[PDB]
Every structure is written in structure tokens, then in C-alpha cells.
Design a protein around this ligand. Structure first.
Ligand SMILES: [Zn+2]
Ligand SMILES: [Zn+2]
Lengths: 49, 256, 49, 213, 97, 102, 111, 267
RNA sequence: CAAUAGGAGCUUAC
């Protein structure tokens, strides 16, 4: 790990054992048609998106 | 079009200069057609520390004044107060809620049978003045049967299920009033529905086709007087549905 | 340095949470225990940033 | 116990009344000004300690300066009544006594309330003037407050000078209600103009004038 | 960030989790990139800002119109006084200086 | 996951006009008769046999906002309903929502 | 907790036997009057706690969204427990938690 | 959010115990604030009891209606307001002089209890209990629901004439009752201030109202570091206080003037 | 030397 470049995936330390029931197919699918054109929308402040 | 869901009970807090504090609101609709029919609130009069009577009073559709709850429970066919409480109280051991339930029982102690309570409802049915008891009862019984929770059922002989749903609504009201459960979220997206082309065109077509059938009636009143056979191809003005659908889809104004 | 400061603030917030959960947090005048907890956490995170 | 507190509040109210009289222009003996709580308790209270409010009622005469300045300034009567509620009976007695000894102004300090039926006799007792105050209101002298600048009622000649200097009519001035606490404290009648000098952060000093409704 | 779901901000968190990440702390920078959760929380905050900008301007414009109508007739006159259209004095000297 | 968090008009329509997420879908509606039949098979007891003096632990079942019965053991009912939906026997766009505290 | 009539099935209200000075309970519909056990007639509370442990079911272990803790069951030494805070939602409520064993099903606390 | 700023007398203003005593004097407590749970017992014989805790107490208190009120008083709540049983029982007798007879358990008693007797009465007791719980005052000024012990960094000259900071205890409150708090001994009666300038007008006059109005407007503007020149806010507060009373910036204020009809209609 | 009105909807910049 310890990658100073890739973003830190959250620690999630409070919970001892996770029991997942579902997974996102891909997180970028939360956006709609118009927001899907934006490249790297996770590097912008939301009003600009 | 985005709209709140139908046939779900939601309980809301109220404001300081309001005698009403807690309101359970349900809108009703049928599985066939998915159209609204009637709405029926159950409000909690009495503010915190003011308004000494913390009673709960319903609001039936097609009646001007709000009826107490025990009155309508008796009118629906469960007279003994033990059974009324049991329809409201699932767990006798709980005591705070039962302590908040007495003023309703006291404000509706007068009634002891179904006929008198159902008349008491009838005396408020917003109809013409001076109907005699035997048909005031029929009018009120019709209101209690249809236009009261049509989603439950609209046929007679199944009043117990409506009483149980009323007990559930009152219990959720009290849970919100006794702080044992949180108030319903207005902005929650799971309590909303989206009306696409299907239901929108269904509503508009229902309106315009009832227009057409009224036209058919208004033609069969006259033409039948002549005592002639008619081929029904001059009895339907086809331009009504066409003009209505075209007007709504071309302007956007959804209605006549 | 930045990630160390953020981790230290996360530990501080976790300690505030522990103190609030075992009922040992010191309230403030005109302010509830839950509002005191929230105010202290907001102070910590603003100072972290 | 609670009697000491009642006596102290009554003494503070009495000192406020005397400060009112001296501010309004009446002569007050310097020794009765500095009336202290214990000496007041000696001269007023009883063996049981409860106070006789009928001895506090005094008579004040105008200082000669407030006569050379306010020529319309007569003689004052101040009565602390003993009945908490005051009705038309007591107001009738007060007006009879005021007209009986041609007192120009009569201040009637009451305890609890003055009923409207009694209150209607207050203005119909010309040419004397009757004003009433409640003791609870008089506990603090509000003209000593930092936010309350010093009000000084003008004389007729000075009011005319004020109106002519600004080429003004009476209705074009800022106004003060006769029921204003500082107009009530000063015994302002309709048409009289106070002058209000006050702090000014842009100029240092600023003189304001208000006319009485 | 409020518990919009039942006892949580997002359905990717557990119940009653008060940690900074659950309730709207964004640990990354814009250069590093936001996670989907941080992206959604930042979207809620930006949406709140846009609503505020859109909605308060009407109250502000109403307030400024009422102030202008209340003060529209007030002028400093040649004698130094500050009077309205009725000639009534508002200040005997403008600004007191 | 349901409406785009970024696409919304500026101005007076802000937040009222929404835009669907790419994988969003709107239900068409479905007959409730097979649902009721499946519920009746697996053990739901009706409200004409209901007595809250005894049923202090039973879980109450709502169908389309209509309270239709109670069950002694929601675990196997939700498991079987989810398996039926995931096998195709039930329309895939049918919600199967267990609430545990209530 | 007010009772109900053994004959008329309505609810009984208090009354006084002035010839015996004992608190009975009077039916406002029928004439039946039974002896009571408890002389309490009224109650009122402002500091209440109903809803502390009530937010628990048998199958609360089946909730997959509840966070799981390592607290020791004092009862059953279980190293796996789901936990949650007071389910009462008032403003002045505590923030102490509750702990449910998935092994022993006893609810406990950390005190 | 109504609020007073109660400046204390200097002797109090430096000591903290004295400031807390003044706080206790200014704060409002009702029987609600110190009451846990009220009961009702049927006690047919006044000289005896059907209960088992207070029998010894009433046998030590002796050597009407059989309806009894048994209200319980929590310990720490009683403890925090410097209140004991004597003042509470006296206060109850103050408004129930002879239409009520009050018994009260002692303060060291393992159960803090109060017993009352009426002189069918199972509902007048409920009404009286409600009226007591909702209208009996114990100490303080009505209208002051909370009080805080605040610190003010006043700048005062030294004995050399040079300005030096000085750390004094003052008071902030919730709610408003200006007239009664100004009178309370230990308060600087010449400096008490309210953030509701309608109260100022009713109590202190119109010039003090103008001063308070300017203070509020300056606070609202300068909150965020904005600076508006003095004369603009002075003009705004002078227009609002020119008639002798507060003229609101609304149609109900602007259109009740004597100006021409066309101006008023144009607004 | 003469280019309708009323509505609704979508947008622009604050
Ligand atoms: Zn009976
Ligand atoms: Zn165990």
C-alpha cells in the first residue's frame, strides 16, 4: 500500500467484520447522461459539475 | 411527474401556534387504475403542556367536521372498549401510551352502539338538511364502506380489516407523539412515485372517455324519444378523444 | 506530515466518540450533550483541515 | 426576612421620587435627599416593622430658578397610597384634597393597579394635574441608565426660539409620547419640547429635540 | 452530513457510525481525487450552496426594495437638517457631523 | 444511484427538476395476486384470525401499503421471496423489504 | 394500567364507598363493582426511559447492517456482538450503547 | 432568540461565588423544574395512612377530604438550585393558604415526599396538580428561562491613566424581563441591556431605543467583518424612531404615514 | 407611408 499518489480508500476500522449484501456495478453509474460526459468529475468542486 | 406514494401512512410534526401537534396523513388509491380516490387524516389536538385535551380526531372525506376516533371505531362495528383498545394496543404491558389514550375514551364515552355513532357521523355528512334517521344511517354507512380506505376493500362485510388499519394508523400516530419513533421523512425518495406516459395518458383518456360516454347519454336521451333504430355511427363524436389528447400533448396542460 | 495530522485528528475524534459513548464528556452551557459532541468534533476537524 | 427587602425596595422608590422632584425643578432639602435605608426604616416602619406609607407623603416647593425659568411651575403633592388597588373612591378623595389646597401638580404613587373607571377622573380635574406612577416602575431611576441621555424640558421662549431657528412648525419635529417613560418621569405636557444631549461617535456631541404628543 | 438513510448517511456505511468519514469528512484533496462517498457528500454541500444562492436573493431584493421605498423621500436640506417629503425632521444635522 | 447528483437546472427550478441516473429504471407495475398467493403458501396468517393478546412477537406484513397479515418468522419468508425473485418466478422489479426493529 | 369489566367489557373507573371508605372501581354502564388491589389512581412522568431496551427482537442478530463489536459477553464470554445506541430519539438522551450477543442473545451494556 | 446582558455590580463582578448567587437569584424555577412524578393516594383517615414509609413521619408530625397528592422530588435536581424543602412547602402554602393542607417529608429522608389534603374529588385534585405543576414559581424573574455565566474583556484605565484589560463576570440570559431584572440588587441598574428594542422602548424611552437599534444593526452588519459607515445606519434608525414609536419597514408602517396618496400606492 | 394579444414551457447572467 502506502501509495502517496493513489487516493486512500477509507479505513473503515470501527466495524470488526463486514457482511456485504450488494456491490456497485461501477460507481460512475450514479451520474446521469449529462454528467457522464465530464472527465474526472471527482476532481472538481460540485458546482462546476 | 414526481408524486408522493399512495396508500402509505406518514406522520408529521406541527407548529407552535397550532392546536394540532401530530398528523397522520394517508392518500388512497386502487390497484386497478392506480388513481387517487380519497384522503383521511387523524390529527392529535393538544399542544405540549397546553390544550389540555390530547385527544385524537379523524377527518373522513365528505364530512365537514372532524369525528373522534372511538366514534368511528364503534360505527365500524366494534363496540366494547376492551376490543377498541386491543385494536390500538398490541401490548397491554406498555403504560405511557395507554395513559395518553384516556382523553379519547372520555370524549367518546357517550356512544354505546353502532347506529347512534353512525348517525353522529351522518349528522355531519355535508348533505342536504333534515334527512330522517333511517337514511341518514344509509348515507353514513355508504361513506364508511366506500371512500374510506378504498385500497383496503370497497365491499361490505370486511369492516374488521379497516378497523385494524385504523388501529395501525393511530398506533403510529402515538409512537410519533410519545417520541418512541421518529417522524416520517418527506424528502425520502423511497416514498415517491414517477408517473410516466402510461399513467398520464390513462388519466387523460379516462377524463375524455367519460366525456364521450356523457355525450352518448346526452344523445340517447333525445334520439330514443323518436322511437327509431340507430346505427351508433352518428352517436359517437369521435373528435372528442382526438381533440383532447391532441390539446393536452400539444400544450402540456394535463386536463380538460 | 499532512496524512499524519489527519490520522491524529481521526484518533482525536475517535477518542471524543469513546468519551461520549461511555458518558464522560463535559457539556457546555446552553448546549446539549449531543450538540456538545458535534461541536467538539466539528472544531477538531476544522482545525485538522 | 422578606420585610427587609420590601422596605429596601420602597426606600429606593422614595429616593427615585425625590430625584424626580429635584430634576423637575422643585426644592428638596439636602438631608432628605441622602435619606439612608436604616434611618428611613427608623422614621417609617412600625414595631411590627411594616411601614406607614402615609408619612412618606410630602410637599415640595419650586426652587426659585425653576420659577424664573418655568413660570408655569406650581406646587407639588406626592402621595404614597396604602390601598394596593385604587378605585374611584380613593381618586375622588385625592382630587378633593388637591383642589382643596390649590396644589398645581399631584403625583399619586400606587402599588398594584389603577382601574380605568378611576383612571378617567385623572384628566377631568382641571386646572390641577394628576399623574400616577406604580412603585415597581420607580425602583430604578431610568435617567441614570447609560443608554438614557439627559432630557431637559425647554421653556416656552426657548421652544419658540427653537421653532424659529429651524423655520419649523410643531408637527415637523421628531416626537415623544406623553406616555414615554422619560416624558412620564419628567411630567411633560402636550406641546413641550425636551432637549436631549447625547454621545456622538462622529462629532463628539449632538443635541436632539423632541416634541411631546 | 445528516443520516438521510436510517441511522446512516449512505447505504455503504453501518448503523450509528459517527466517524468523520460517515458524516461528511473528505480526507482527500481535489488533486488526489474524491471517493464516490466523498463525491456524493460534496455534491450535497454544493447543492445546498446553489439553493442558498438561488433562494436568498429574492428575500434580499425584497428587503432592499422596502428599504428604498422607506428611505426614498429623505434628503439633506440647505439648512443642514435631514427631512422627508412632509418636511419632518429625521436628523437635525446629517450624520451628526 | 437513482437521480444524477449533478444535473439539475440553475435558478428557480433548482432541485425540483431531476435527471435519472444511467442505470435507473422505473417500475411498470405488476399484479399483486401471485405475491399474495406466495405469501399465503409460506405461512402468513390472516387478520380475521388475529388477536394481539397472543401475537406479541409476530411480524406484520404490508403489501403495496396494505396490511394483509402477520408471520411468526419473517426470516424464511424473506429468504424464500428473495429466492423466488432471483429465480424469475416473481417480477424482478418487485420490492421485498424486511424491517427488523419495527 | 386500567382494567376492563368482567361482564360488560368496558373499563372501570374509581369511586368511594363512603360507608366503608375503601376505593372500589365503578362501571359507568353496568352495576358490577369489584374490589381492587392497588390504591394508586394516577401517575405522571417527565423523566421517562421507556424505549431503552425495547428496541430489540429475537432476530436482531439477523440485521446485516448493525456494526459488530468485540465486547466480552459477561454472561457467555462471546467475542462477537452487534451494538447500537439508545433508540430513544430525544434531544437530551444519553449516548450510551447497547450490546446484543449473537451467541447468548442477552442484551448488555458497558458500565 | 431574546436575550438580556446583565452587567453585575463590581463587588459581585469580580467574585465568582457571588456571581453564581446572583445567577441563582435571577433564574426562574417552577415546581416542574424540581418535580419527578406526582401520585394520588386515597387516604380515608387523616391521622393514619395505608402507606408504609411515611407512617412514622406522620406519627412524629401529630404528637377533611381523604384525597392525597404524593409528589416526589429528585435529589440532584433539588441540590442544584440551592433549594430545600422549607421554601418549597412555604411557597405552596403561599397560594394555597387555607384551601389546602400540606405535609412534607424531611430533606434527609430516604424518600423526598410531599403530602396534601383537600378541605367525588378525584378530578379537582388533578386540576389542582396541573395548576401547581404549571404555575407555581419558586424564585427568580418570570421570563428568564436560562442564565449563563459569561466573561467580558472590558478595557478600563489603570491607576496611571493607561488603558488595561480587566476580567469581569457578567450575565447573559434567555427570555426577556427588563424591568424586574434591572431592580434586582447586585445588578448594575444603569447598564442592563436587551436585544429586543421594543422592550427598550416600553422601559427606557425612544432615545435608548434608537441606541439599541443602532447596536443591533451594527451587530448584524459587522458580524462578518463588513463595515458600513455610521451615518447610513444612523439614518435608518432615525427614520424608524422619528414618530416616537417604532415604525417598521413594511406596508403597515410605510403606508400609515401622512405622505401623498401616489407615493403610498406606488409602493 | 403603416410589422396583434394573451398564456404556458425551456433557457442566459447575477
Ligand atoms: Zn362493567
Ligand atoms: Zn452470551
Amino acid at each position: 500500500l502506502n501509495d502517496t499518489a493513489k487516493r486512500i480508500k477509507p479505513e473503515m476500522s470501527t466495524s470488526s467484520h463486514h457482511t456485504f449484501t450488494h456491490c456497485e456495478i461501477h460507481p460512475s453509474m450514479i451520474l446521469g447522461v449529462a454528467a457522464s460526459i465530464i472527465p474526472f468529475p471527482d476532481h472538481n468542486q460540485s458546482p462546476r459539475n | 411527474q414526481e408524486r408522493s406514494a399512495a396508500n402509505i401512512v406518514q406522520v408529521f410534526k406541527k407548529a407552535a401556534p397550532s392546536p394540532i401537534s401530530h398528523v397522520a396523513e394517508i392518500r388512497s388509491a386502487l390497484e386497478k387504475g392506480s388513481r387517487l380516490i380519497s384522503t383521511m387524516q387523524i390529527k392529535l389536538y393538544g399542544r405540549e403542556d397546553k390544550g389540555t385535551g390530547r385527544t385524537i380526531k379523524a377527518t373522513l372525506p365528505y364530512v365537514k367536521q372532524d369525528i373522534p376516533i372511538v366514534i368511528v371505531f364503534r360505527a365500524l362495528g366494534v363496540v366494547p372498549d376492551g376490543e377498541i383498545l386491543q385494536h390500538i394496543c398490541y401490548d397491554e404491558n406498555d403504560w405511557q401510551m395507554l395513559e395518553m389514550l384516556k382523553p379519547c375514551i372520555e370524549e367518546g364515552f357517550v356512544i354505546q352502539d353502532k347506529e347512534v355513532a353512525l348517525d353522529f357521523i351522518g349528522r355531519r355528512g355535508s348533505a342536504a338538511l333534515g334527512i330522517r334517521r333511517e337514511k341518514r344511517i344509509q348515507y353514513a354507512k355508504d361513506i364508511l364502506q366506500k371512500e374510506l380506505l378504498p385500497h383496503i376493500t370497497q365491499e361490505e362485510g370486511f369492516e374488521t380489516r379497516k378497523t385494524f388499519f385504523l388501529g395501525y394508523m393511530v398506533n403510529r400516530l402515538l409512537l410519533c407523539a410519545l417520541e418512541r419513533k421518529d417522524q416520517d421523512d418527506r424528502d425520502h425518495f423511497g416514498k415517491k412515485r414517477l408517473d410516466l406516459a402510461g399513467p398520464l395518458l390513462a388519466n387523460l383518456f379516462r377524463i375524455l372517455f367519460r366525456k364521450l360516454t356523457r355525450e352518448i347519454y346526452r344523445y340517447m336521451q333525445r334520439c330514443i324519444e323518436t322511437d327509431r333504430d340507430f346505427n351508433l355511427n352518428l352517436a359517437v363524436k369521435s373528435t372528442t378523444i382526438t381533440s383532447g389528447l391532441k390539446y393536452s400533448l400539444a400544450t402540456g396542460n394535463w386536463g380538460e | 506530515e499532512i496524512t499524519h495530522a489527519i490520522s491524529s485528528a481521526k484518533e482525536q475524534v475517535q477518542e471524543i466518540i469513546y468519551k461520549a459513548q461511555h458518558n464522560e464528556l463535559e457539556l457546555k452551557p446552553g448546549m446539549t450533550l449531543r450538540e456538545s459532541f458535534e461541536g467538539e468534533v466539528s472544531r477538531t476537524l476544522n482545525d485538522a483541515r | 426576612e422578606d420585610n427587609n427587602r420590601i422596605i429596601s425596595r420602597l426606600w429606593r422608590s422614595f429616593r427615585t421620587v425625590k430625584e424626580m422632584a429635584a430634576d423637575r425643578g422643585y426644592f428638596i432639602s439636602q438631608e432628605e435627599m441622602d435619606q439612608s435605608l436604616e434611618e428611613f426604616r427608623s422614621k417609617i416602619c412600625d414595631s411590627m416593622g411594616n411601614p406607614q406609607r402615609k408619612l412618606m407623603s410630602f410637599l415640595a416647593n419650586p426652587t426659585p430658578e425653576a420659577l424664573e425659568k418655568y413660570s408655569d411651575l406650581g406646587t407639588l403633592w406626592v402621595e404614597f397610597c396604602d390601598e394596593p388597588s385604587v378605585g374611584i373612591k380613593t381618586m375622588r378623595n385625592f382630587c378633593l384634597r388637591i383642589q382643596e389646597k390649590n396644589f398645581s401638580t399631584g403625583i399619586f404613587i400606587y402599588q398594584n393597579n389603577i382601574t380605568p373607571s378611576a383612571n378617567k377622573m385623572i384628566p377631568t380635574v382641571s386646572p390641577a394635574i394628576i399623574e400616577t406612577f406604580q412603585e415597581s416602575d420607580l425602583v430604578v431611576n431610568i435617567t441614570h441608565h447609560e443608554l438614557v441621555p439627559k432630557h431637559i424640558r425647554l421653556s416656552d421662549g426657548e421652544k419658540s426660539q427653537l421653532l424659529q431657528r429651524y423655520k419649523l412648525k410643531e408637527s415637523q419635529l421628531p416626537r415623544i409620547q406623553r406616555e414615554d417613560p422619560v416624558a412620564r418621569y419628567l411630567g411633560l405636557k402636550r406641546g413641550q419640547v425636551v432637549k436631549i444631549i447625547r454621545r456622538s461617535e462622529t462629532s463628539g456631541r449632538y443635541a436632539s429635540y423632541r416634541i411631546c404628543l | 452530513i445528516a443520516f438521510g438513510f436510517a441511522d446512516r448517511s449512505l447505504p455503504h456505511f453501518t448503523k450509528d457510525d459517527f466517524s468523520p468519514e460517515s458524516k461528511g469528512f473528505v480526507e482527500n484533496s481535489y488533486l488526489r481525487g474524491l471517493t464516490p462517498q466523498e463525491f456524493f457528500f460534496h455534491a450535497m454541500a454544493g447543492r445546498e450552496g446553489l439553493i442558498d444562492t438561488a433562494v436568498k436573493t429574492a428575500e434580499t431584493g425584497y428587503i432592499q426594495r422596502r428599504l428604498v421605498k422607506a428611505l426614498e423621500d429623505i434628503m439633506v436640506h440647505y439648512d443642514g437638517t435631514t427631512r422627508n417629503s412632509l418636511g419632518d425632521i429625521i436628523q437635525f444635522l446629517y450624520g451628526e457631523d | 444511484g437513482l437521480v444524477c447528483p449533478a444535473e439539475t437546472p440553475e435558478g428557480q427550478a433548482c432541485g425540483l427538476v431531476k435527471n435519472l441516473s444511467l442505470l435507473s429504471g422505473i417500475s411498470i407495475g405488476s399484479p399483486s395476486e401471485p405475491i399474495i398467493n406466495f405469501l399465503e403458501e409460506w405461512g402468513m396468517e390472516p387478520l380475521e384470525d388475529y388477536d394481539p393478546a397472543q401475537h406479541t412477537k409476530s411480524t406484520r406484513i404490508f403489501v403495496n401499503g396494505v396490511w394483509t397479515g402477520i408471520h411468526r418468522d419473517p426470516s424464511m419468508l424473506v429468504s424464500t421471496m428473495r429466492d423466488l425473485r432471483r429465480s424469475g418466478a416473481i417480477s424482478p422489479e418487485v420490492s421485498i423489504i424486511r424491517d427488523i426493529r419495527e | 394500567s386500567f382494567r376492563f369489566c368482567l361482564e360488560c367489557n368496558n373499563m372501570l373507573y374509581p369511586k368511594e364507598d363512603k360507608e366503608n371508605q375503601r376505593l372500589l372501581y365503578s362501571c359507568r354502564n353496568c352495576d358490577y363493582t369489584e374490589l381492587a388491589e392497588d390504591p394508586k389512581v394516577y401517575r405522571h412522568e417527565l423523566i421517562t426511559n421507556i424505549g431503552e431496551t425495547a428496541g430489540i427482537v429475537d432476530d436482531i442478530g439477523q440485521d446485516p447492517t448493525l456494526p459488530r463489536s468485540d465486547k466480552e459477553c459477561p454472561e457467555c464470554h462471546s467475542r462477537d456482538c452487534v451494538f447500537f445506541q439508545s433508540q430513544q430519539r430525544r434531544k437530551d438522551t444519553n449516548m450510551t450503547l447497547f450490546y446484543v450477543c449473537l451467541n447468548c442473545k442477552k442484551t448488555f451494556r458497558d458500565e | 432568540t431574546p436575550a438580556l446582558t446583565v452587567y453585575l455590580d463590581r463587588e459581585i463582578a469580580l467574585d465568582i461565588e457571588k456571581a453564581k448567587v446572583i445567577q441563582s437569584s435571577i433564574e426562574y424555577t417552577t415546581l416542574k423544574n424540581v418535580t419527578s412524578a406526582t401520585e394520588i393516594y386515597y387516604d380515608p383517615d387523616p391521622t393514619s395512612t395505608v402507606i408504609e414509609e411515611d407512617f412514622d413521619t406522620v406519627e412524629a408530625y401529630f404528637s377533611q377530604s381523604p384525597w392525597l397528592l404524593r409528589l416526589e422530588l429528585d435529589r440532584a435536581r433539588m441540590l442544584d438550585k440551592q433549594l430545600t424543602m422549607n421554601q418549597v412547602a412555604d411557597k405552596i402554602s403561599e397560594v394555597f393558604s387555607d384551601d389546602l393542607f400540606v405535609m412534607w417529608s424531611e430533606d434527609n429522608a430516604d424518600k423526598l415526599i410531599i403530602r396534601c389534603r383537600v378541605i367525588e374529588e378525584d378530578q379537582m385534585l388533578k386540576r389542582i396538580e396541573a395548576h401547581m405543576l404549571d404555575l407555581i414559581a419558586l424564585r427568580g424573574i418570570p421570563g428568564i428561562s436560562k442564565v449563563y455565566m459569561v466573561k467580558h474583556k472590558v478595557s478600563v484605565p489603570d491607576e496611571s491613566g493607561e488603558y488595561k484589560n480587566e476580567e469581569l463576570w457578567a450575565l447573559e440570559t434567555d427570555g426577556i424581563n427588563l424591568a424586574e431584572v434591572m431592580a434586582v440588587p447586585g445588578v448594575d441598574s444603569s447598564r442592563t441591556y436587551s436585544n429586543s428594542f421594543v422592550e427598550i422602548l416600553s422601559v427606557l424611552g425612544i432615545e435608548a431605543t434608537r441606541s439599541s437599534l443602532y447596536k443591533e444593526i451594527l451587530n448584524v452588519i459587522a458580524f462578518d467583518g463588513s463595515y458600513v459607515n455610521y451615518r447610513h445606519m444612523a439614518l435608518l434608525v432615525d427614520v424608524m424612531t422619528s414618530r416616537g414609536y417604532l415604525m417598521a419597514i413594511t406596508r403597515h408602517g410605510i403606508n400609515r404615514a401622512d405622505t401623498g396618496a401616489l407615493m403610498r400606492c406606488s409602493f
